[PDB]
Amino acid sequence: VGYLQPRTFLLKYNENGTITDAVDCALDPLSETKCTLKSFTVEKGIYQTS
Amino acid sequence: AIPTNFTISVTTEILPVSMTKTSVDCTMYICGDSTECSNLLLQYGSFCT
């Protein structure tokens, strides 16, 4: 049993119209940067967050 | 006219190079500590980006 919480989730849709990947935008600074840049594979470099 | 004597002078020129790097947070400058303001600004996220 789990309690759902209102968290921002980034979804990745494929060609079948179904959700195949979900990223929790509120969990880590790297996840926040991925949600802000709308990407899933960030390279090397510094980034500014909130 | 043919120059005979000579003098030595030093010319100083002032030229800027660069300035200071600044960062302006869109959320902290528009809303800050609010929920409805952030929900309304989410529609204008492209501008802040």
From Swiss-Prot, chain B:
Protein origin, superkingdom: Viruses
Residues linked to a glycan: N5
S-S bonds: C26-C48, C31-C37
Role description: Precursor of the fusion protein processed in the biosynthesis of the S protein and the formation of virus particle. Mediates fusion of the virion and cellular membranes by functioning as a class I viral fusion protein. Contains two viral fusion peptides that are unmasked after cleavage. The S2/S2' cleavage occurs during virus entry at the cell membrane by host TMPRSS2 or during endocytosis by host CSTL.
Protein name: Spike protein S2
Lineage: Viruses, Riboviria, Orthornavirae, Pisuviricota, Pisoniviricetes
